[PDB]
Design a binder for this molecule. Sequence first.
Ligand SMILES: Nc1ncnc2c1ncn2[C@@H]1O[C@H](CSCC[C@H](N)C(=O)O)[C@@H](O)[C@H]1O
Ligand SMILES: [Zn+2]
Length: 148
Amino acid sequence: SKSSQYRKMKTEWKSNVYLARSRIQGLGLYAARDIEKHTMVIEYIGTIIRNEVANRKEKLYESQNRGVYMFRMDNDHVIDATLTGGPARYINHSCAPNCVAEVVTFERGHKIIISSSRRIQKGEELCYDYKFDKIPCHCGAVNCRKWM
Ligand SMILES: Nc1ncnc2c1ncn2[C@@H]1O[C@H](CSCC[C@H](N)C(=O)O)[C@@H](O)[C@H]1O
Ligand SMILES: [Zn+2]
């Protein structure tokens, strides 16, 4: 049951991850322990805001040469982790991910859950495919698409 998986992950995620210097860019999130395939690791949390508001914010931050932490969604909304976020905001992109950022809709709502797509060893850096629609990718993978 997704909702039981979710409830369990919500009380465990702190022991699933840690924050350290990335092998990809800046800071990154790492598996604190071994994690089985198809397992909820952590949630992307923040404040859901309309695209219009998000764009204004991004534009304001770029003026000071700062990035934002935002997970773009299909409903013209965004989860804004720039001010109130969690560790999942630090998970980097990979052309060869060990994770997926999946939509999970259930009793408690419409959530973005990061889950393992393979067995993941302690100390591996976590990453998922950001899925793009233009700056160079540093995921290091063999089949890197070179750009983001
Ligand atoms: N595979 C990749 N190659 C190059 N830059 C990446 C990347 N994955 C993530 N990033 C960078 O990280 C941002 C997502 S925020 C993720 C955490 C970030 N590494 C940090 O230290 O704050 C992107 O805007 C991009 O600047
Ligand atoms: Zn890449």
